[PDB]
Amino acid sequence: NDEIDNAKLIMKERRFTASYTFAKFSTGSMLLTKDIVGKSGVSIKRLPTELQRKFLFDDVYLDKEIEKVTIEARKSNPYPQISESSLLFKDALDYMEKTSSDYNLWKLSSILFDPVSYPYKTDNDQVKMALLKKERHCRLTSWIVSQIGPEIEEKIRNSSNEIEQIFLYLLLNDVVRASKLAIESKNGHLSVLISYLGSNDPRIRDLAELQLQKWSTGGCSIDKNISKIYKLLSGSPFEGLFSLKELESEFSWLCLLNLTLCYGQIDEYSLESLVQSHLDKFSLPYDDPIGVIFQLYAANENTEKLYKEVRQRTNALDVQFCWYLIQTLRFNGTRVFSKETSDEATFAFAAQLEFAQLHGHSLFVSCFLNDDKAAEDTIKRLVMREITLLRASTNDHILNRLKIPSQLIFNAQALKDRYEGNYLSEVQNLLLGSSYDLAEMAIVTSLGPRLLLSNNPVQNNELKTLREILNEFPDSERDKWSVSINVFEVYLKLVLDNVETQETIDSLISGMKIFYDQYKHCREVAACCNVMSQEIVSKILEKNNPSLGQPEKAYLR
């Protein structure tokens, strides 16, 4: 009761309230959100993962992304970077589910954001180059055609004009079938016209144009779909005298992209310019993810600007995906992209990978900071922070074997196992471990009252087999000895052989005096120097003041 009002007036000096909460971050970046009922009085919360792809949880998919990458031994900093990302978007099409426009999204970038080429050389350069774009076009139009699959098949089933069915067959790219239905309407001359298609040529455009115009200055009544057949024939599906807006209220904008790439000339233009003229005509959403693929194939030329803007408008692509495009196509160079686009998307992606406790995969991503200090601090920090997450795989442990100096990660390891609660065997693993490359000062101060466990000849000669390593490795941090570790040269040759002082005894009383200073925090380590003294000078009549009273140095009396 007394406690209640006490803590009230205390916490109103403090200007705290009687209900309080905190949650703070830790070594795997996770929360300790106080709730009041626990015996730790926290509920350790997972911070939500903003990246939840089911094929990150394969570590061989970490390894596929290392192999489509040329790893760069970098010369501003020793830590790994990437010289060349030729990263494929076909490396997740074997771990992904295969139904989803997540699969079609990632496939669309497999035709566009990774190359497509024709295998063997055709004789002229203009022809060679056209057959890369024609090969890319075979896959691409398959894609366009596949995805307008249901909407066209729905209207096949439904009641339709005869010429509305010929037009819809042609949308799924069927030519013979369309001719055969032309044949059935008793129209032979028409069926000739359906069997130009799949092909345009320049003379039929001028005749198709001349005939639509004959109609205008002609009488009344026309069919619309018949007018559509001549729009294909004019070579010009939208860029003729009529523009098709009857199929963006009934069909998609993708149903429009089929019309340019198949009857809006068949790659006598480049792809890139065709899809760009087709953005300008029809606004391809900034909100569909498969939409934005088209848009940054259209704006290949100066990608960076339109990419920043639409990354705010499409969040049904994940932060993985946004990062992937900058990586692949910046060391290929086809998309203008700064370094700092890659540096912002690296931080972001790596940071979500960390919230899933995928820090191996985080490491690999933070390597694609190709600003020099940025992959100094990030690589350093992420290894020194967590060790067991980076030995959780062998592929993890390869990324520390990579261009990282054993050295970093053993330095993380034994920094961790340096406590005071296990500390005899793991302060040995700074010296035995040798990433600190001599650091046995704290082994002096961890072998004070740990010669009080047993004295036997190779526990005696353990302090002359980690003290010969004093000189095998040159003086490094905390080091330069052979007064305080000329104690244990001659502690051996004292208690073995009765000695008339060889004057390394005279180094060792000084060394015990140095050792009294050092206690590095433990109960007694500055009175264990007495123990080791009063063990041994006492091999001449010599009494000297301790390292108290006279039996604390010598054991003569």
Partner: protein
């Protein structure tokens, strides 16, 4: 039941949850799942013990904890049997913060109290606690914390509403007053410098008028842009907060027992994350 906890920080390796409560004990629940196992009850302090802070290893781990009384007891393991090494008892009001430095700077313990003082409690192997006192505010300093962004500062936030960037000189092993920021009607409770691994640093000025003003810099020396997390008077006086090491999720605790995790999207403006 556990009495009202006021901090429970974890190790640098993520093991020893230090629940320092209004029972005057820091209960070291060394974490193995839900077997947060009580390895020591740290009886010493004479009022409600508010903050813990662990040092990163280089010697062990040294827990430094602070309390109402004025005692920051320098807890260190001797084979897990924790005791004070020494006592830093210099502070005559309720001590706010305790907070260990990276070992780029040294083992420098940064202690502030709302008696006005901020001591750079420089530590040594001979088990001494060495204060380099400045008085940064005079209605009290309610936090002080370092600035290990890529450098070398501590920021103060206190009771006179000022937020003073103490940037480096080390002319004495205390830093000089670079600038002074202002924009609150009530006490800057917590100054949460971003411990990011990139050039940008932010500073969530978590306050008692409940304006969590994140002054957004785009660099070390950059502009102090008023782009508040919460741009209103959010319910109950806002308690302690930190920035993620990587991901920049402002874990803005309330006093309303919700922690508004509010990640960053690139424009220096803030959208939810739980």
């Amino acid at each position: 039941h556990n009495e009202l906890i006021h901090d429970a920080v974890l190790d640098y390796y993520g093991k020893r949850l230090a629940t320092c409560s209004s029972d005057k004990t820091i209960k070291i629940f060394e974490v193995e799942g839900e077997t947060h196992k009580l390895i020591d009850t740290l009886t010493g302090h004479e009022g409600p013990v508010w903050r813990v802070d662990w040092a990163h290893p280089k010697f062990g781990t040294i827990l430094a904890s602070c309390s109402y009384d004025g005692k920051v007891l320098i807890w260190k393991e001797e084979n897990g049997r924790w005791s004070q090494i020494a006592v830093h008892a210099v502070h005559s009001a309720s001590v706010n913060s305790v907070q260990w430095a990276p070992h780029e700077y040294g083992p420098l313990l940064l202690v502030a109290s709302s008696d006005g003082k901020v001591s750079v409690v420089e530590f040594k192997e001979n088990g001494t606690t060495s204060p380099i006192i400045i008085d940064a505010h005079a209605i009290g300093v309610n936090s002080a914390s370092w600035a290990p962004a890529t450098s070398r500062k501590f920021v103060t936030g206190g009771a006179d509403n000022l937020v003073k960037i103490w940037k480096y000189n080390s002319d004495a092993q205390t830093y000089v007053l670079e600038s002074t920021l202002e924009g609150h009607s009530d006490w800057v409770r917590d100054v949460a410098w971003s411990p990011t691994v990139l050039l940008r640093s932010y500073l969530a000025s978590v306050s008692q008028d409940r304006t969590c003003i994140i002054w957004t810099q785009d660099n070390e020396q950059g502009p102090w842009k008023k782009t508040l997390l919460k741009e209103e008077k959010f319910p109950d006086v806002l308690w302690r907060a930190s920035w993620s090491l990587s991901g920049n999720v402002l874990a803005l605790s309330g006093g309303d027992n919700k922690v508004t995790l509010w990640k960053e999207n690139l424009e220096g403006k803030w959208e939810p994350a739980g």
